[PDB]
Structure 1
Amino acid sequence: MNDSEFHRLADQLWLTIEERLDDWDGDSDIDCEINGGVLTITFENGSKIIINRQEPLHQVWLATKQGGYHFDLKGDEWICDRSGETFWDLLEQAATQQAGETVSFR
């Protein structure tokens, strides 16, 4: 993947995450902040989910209370480079677990 393609895809992913988290209307209070380009989602129990870009590798990284996951773009989808699971499935699973409420953007 070229650098420009990564900027394009990551920018689009950032917008989608920001909009989805801003349009959150569930019962739980979920906060999303962008600092130094890094997205941090904070839940009521104090836990967090962090999303950042790894420019050199053209990857998006996810850190949750449970673990860490690195993603490559494959078939128009961000895929975990160890399990093949999608970024949205992993983010939603973690957010749901950490919020204690369904966090789905399907």
Structure 2
Amino acid sequence: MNDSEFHRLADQLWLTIEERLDDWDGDSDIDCEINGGVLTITFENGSKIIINRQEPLHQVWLATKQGGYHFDLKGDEWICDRSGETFWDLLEQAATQQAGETVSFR
């Protein structure tokens, strides 16, 4: 039911972020690290973005310099449970702001 689908979609999200950041060619130095399954993106200004799994809830959480965002699996997207906004849009907006460079993955 929910557990296996969570593992499937989260594993895919992890890969998509990892691949996109390894393939980062822009001017800014952006680093991505995985520690205890948690992804940490680090920017040149020392700021970070942290992405982790909340297994009980089947949610992916985002922590940015600006706030914390909790995402529900909904179809082919991750949806911010307060605002309805998508995971990629919010991750791009924060990454763009923290890198001071467009960080656009679509």
* Deviation readout 1:61-105 (Å, 9 max, x if unpaired): 000000000000113100000000000000000000000000001
Shift of residue 9 of structure 1? 0.3
- For structure 1, the 5+ residue unaligned runs are none
What is the rounded CA distance, in whole Å, between the counterparts of 1:41 and 1:90 in structure 2?
14
> Counterpart in 1 of 2:85?
85
Unaligned runs of 5+ in 2: none
**Alignment coverage as a number of residue pairs:** 106
1:94 has 2:82 as partner: no
Backbone CA RMSD of aligned residues = 0.7
Q: Deviations over 1:14-68 (max 9, x none)?
A: 0000000110000000000000000000000000000000000000000000000
1:65 matched to 2:68: no
Q: TM (normalized to structure 1)?
A: 0.98
C-alpha distance in 1 between matches for 2:72 and 2:21 = 22
% identical equivalent positions: 100
Task: Give structure 1 regions of 4+ aligned residues with deviation exceeding 3 angstroms.
Answer: none
TM-score by length of 2: 0.98
